[PDB]
Amino acid sequence: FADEQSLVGRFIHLLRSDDPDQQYLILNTARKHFGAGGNQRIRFTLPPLVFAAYQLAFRYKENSQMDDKWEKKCQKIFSFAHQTISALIKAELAELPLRLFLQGALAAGEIGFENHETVAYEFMSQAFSLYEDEISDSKAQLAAITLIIGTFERMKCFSEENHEPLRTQCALAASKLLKKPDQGRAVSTCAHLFWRVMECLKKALKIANQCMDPSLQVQLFIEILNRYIYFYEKTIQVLNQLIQKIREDLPNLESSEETEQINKHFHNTLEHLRSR
Amino acid sequence: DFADEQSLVGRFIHLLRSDDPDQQYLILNTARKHFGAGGNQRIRFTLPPLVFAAYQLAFRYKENSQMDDKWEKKCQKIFSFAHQTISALIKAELAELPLRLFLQGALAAGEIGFENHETVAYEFMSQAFSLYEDEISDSKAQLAAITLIIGTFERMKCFSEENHEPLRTQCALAASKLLKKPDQGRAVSTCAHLFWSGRNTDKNGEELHGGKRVMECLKKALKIANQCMDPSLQVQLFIEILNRYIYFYEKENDAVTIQVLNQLIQKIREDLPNLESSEETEQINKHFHNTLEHLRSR
Amino acid sequence: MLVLVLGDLHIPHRCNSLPAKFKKLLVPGKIQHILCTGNLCTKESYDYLKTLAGDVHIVRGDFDENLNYPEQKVVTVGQFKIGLIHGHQVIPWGDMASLALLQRQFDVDILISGHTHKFEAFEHENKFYINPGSATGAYNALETNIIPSFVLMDIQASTVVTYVYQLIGDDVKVERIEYKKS
Amino acid sequence: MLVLVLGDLHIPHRCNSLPAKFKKLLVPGKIQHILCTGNLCTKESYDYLKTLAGDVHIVRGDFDENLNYPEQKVVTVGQFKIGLIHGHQVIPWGDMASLALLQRQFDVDILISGHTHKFEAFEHENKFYINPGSATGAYNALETNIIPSFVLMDIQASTVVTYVYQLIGDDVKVERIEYKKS
Questions:
Q1: How many beta carbons lie within 10 A of that of residue A228, not counting itself?
Q2: For chain C, how many structural domains are there in total?
Q3: Pair type for strands C159-168 and C74-77
Q4: Least CA distance to C14: which residue of chain B?
Q5: What stretch of H or E contains D175?
Q6: For residues B218 and B61, what is the distance between their CA atoms, to the nearest angstrom?
Q7: What are the residue boundaries of the structural domains of chain A, listed by start?
Q8: Are D59 and D82 within 8 A, CB to CB?
Q9: What is the topology classification, in CATH, of domain A2-204?
Q10: Taking the domain B1-135, which CATH number applies?
């Protein structure tokens, strides 16, 4: 149960062991009397057991110097973890086991055990299993995939011949955001996922020529005027003539509570974009 | 009607070519003012032949590759003027047909081998992905456009690395955009050729050798083979999968194996018997039965 | 049965018509059945072959103005079962096992192709496959030196004879390779 | 107004609660307004702060069980206008001009952040921006050596004073940097 899950946190804590395997066999006693709990009890106990197995893999990463099997015992965790994540895939949970897989991507990533990232790419595929075809809600689509983009911002661990297919497949998954401001904000960060580039912002410009809310695409233009700063400075004409377009469009919109604050944005962005 | 000026221009297609290429281009434009200032569907009937003339004028510029010198720039002059007149055929209620003229404008880009036409063809690829995407919904014409573009992307060898890989996937949007699964999955199945046979210029004329994603598209082809809700075609897709399991394995694609063949051929000692007995399945049997002769086992 | 097959006329979209030696050698009335693969782009391109015979059948190419053409249609006269397709859905053009395995899908024996604008034909896996090329000399991306050639063929019983007339340059080069249907 | 801000409690999803020195230093009743950025995952994590004060306001994080939390909400008491956000929609975490330009979009002065689990705060473009970190010591991908620290702050009139208590190891390191609101 839920209070049991907090006490599973106590079972993580008062019933850990510095030997990770003695913790693991009692994690298997936590599989015995407690991981044989049900479908909602194992919804309650197993992700902390996975968080235990996270920490057990981190205890194996704390056994990086005193143990030699700890990478394989991170993997002896990992497959057992993955099936325990799959034991929640069997337990009608796919949305939350994304995140544990997303952590299992990073648990493969941050530890770097043997064959970690292909299974994490399989976890990326498992993320693309557990995200890309079950979420029809656009908000739960967005905050998943943008965090997935946010983790793919942190997934530079993939080499440049393995980075691009998920880099397209998230941009594939960024297309499923049924509203274009959900798309383009992901798409703008998809342009940030490359590090060509600026055309994806012209795609985001084209996304901003597809939006229904006219100040919001100008807020997206503001975001474009935010986004035309970064990989520029890290494309040599657009800013002040579009600052002229904010001398243009921010007049020819609502002079509203957002947009006069966006005037107060723009005036203070005039304080910003006067880089002086 | 206005279709008089097909062969009438087609006669002048011959009767233009005897002159020098700019008096050709002059009396192109005077016929673009005598008769090609004819209307909106009249210019649909003369200007793509004038573009076909400009295609031959671009090929006269390639026939004046040693006669003239600025024939490359004269191509650049007329390719803008092509694209202009293709834009003047974009305004002629035509976006589906001027794809192909843009496609040939992309195919006659890379064929002459002169300057600047590739990004013009990429601008034409932008024009391809202008003139295709929003102007279509019929899944038959959606495919046959995009697979022709896929078929064009077989032969888009003039594209470099930064040009080939976005349009590797930019079509794979439109390949997957099709609301019917099979043709989309067949389009996806054609995209498996593009990861196998993607021609780029920085590899010294050779292809990209991108074999780390090809079988995965075949599992994606197997994935769309579970969304079709048409089982005799899905096993025909499985046959097409097996056809492509025939195809890639017998053409140096090292990622596929003999095991799934001798799985899927043995699947269809059941899955092909898992069909309603009619003109399809026993011919699909005699597909497989003679594919067993292709396997050197029958 | 003396039957004349053609393909890719491109009237008037790439090139005009047959050469003067060809319409000389292709007189009306001598043909029983006429098969056009695609790329006729007009209506008179069907009526020009309708002067030649009464059995003229065209499927849809890609440059076609007509939308009424079905894509595939199985036809049979005598002992031979043929299908007709233009060739633009062949991605790419020239695989050895593609035509051997597309044939057995519908259980035919003799295949006629097009859209590649290059003469190439041989025997493979108890079947004979034919690509005549471009009849009016239309351009392909793969072949720049376009040679137009027409092919008249004869079916009597389970054994075919062909007569390809290669107009390499301006002279008729007649070639012939036997085949017997199993 | 002595107000205590926190964030990323992760109860009990990553770590348990505050250290024993912290709940010693954070007695109930002393706080006027309580702002929690996100990651409380439960209900008693709100009631534990509801023992501390009556003005407790939480917006939605990403690990949150609650769906009732609005994302952004402008609040003001006295001379200061604050918004509260967790920080998971900050892609990535640490741009110099992102927080200077998100502030002027809604015309606020003082921003409180989270989700990055790292203490970092300074003054930029007439505004002061605050990232306390992880209060219960939860893990971030960017920071492995997680140091928990709490921040109690004071507003009297248009000039703030802060007291960050760095628990680097086990000892309280009190730091303080002035700021005056324009």
A1: 18
A2: 1
A3: unpaired
A4: B52
A5: strand D171-175
A6: 44
A7: 2-204
A8: no
A9: 1.25.40
A10: 1.25.40.660
Residue range of the domain that includes D60: 2-180
Interface partners of chain D (CB pairs < 8 Å, 3 or more) are A
| C57/C84 Cα distance (integer angstroms) | 9
Experimental technique, in short, is cryo-EM
Q: Flag whether D touches C (3+ CB pairs, 8 A cutoff).
A: no
Token pair 């003027």: residue: B81
Resolution (Å) of this entry = 4.9
Token pair listed for C130: 């034919």
Q: State the amino acid at position A104 in one-letter form.
A: G
| Nearest residue of chain C to residue B244 (CA atoms) | C98
Q: What is the CATH number of the domain that holds C144?
A: 3.60.21.10
Which segments of C26-118 does DSSP mark as H helices, in order? 44-50, 96-106
Lookup: tokens for D53: 């004060």
Whether C89 sits inside 8 A of B293 (CB atoms) is no
> What is the Cα Rg of chain B in Å?
23
Question: Which residue type occupies C153?
Answer: M
Q: Please answer yes or no on whether D104 and A269 come within 8 Å at the CB atom.
A: yes
Cα distance between residue A160 and residue B212, in whole Å: 12
Q: How far apart are CA A163 and CA C30, in angstroms?
A: 64
According to the 3-state scheme, what is the secondary structure of chain A?
CHHHHHHHHHHHHCCCCCCHHHHHHHHHHHHHHHCCCCCCHHHHHHHHHHHHHHHHHHHHHHCCCCCCCHHHHHHHHHHHHHHHHHHHHCCCCCHHHHHHHHHHHHHHHHHCCCCHHHHHHHHHHHHHHHCCCCCCCHHHHHHHHHHHHHHHHHCCCCCCCCCHHHHHHHHHHHHCCCCHHHHHHHHHHHHHCCCCCHHHHHHHHHHHCCCCCHHHHHHHHHHHHHHHHHHHHCCCCHHHHHHHHHCCCCCCCCCCCCHHHHHHHHHHHHHHHCCC
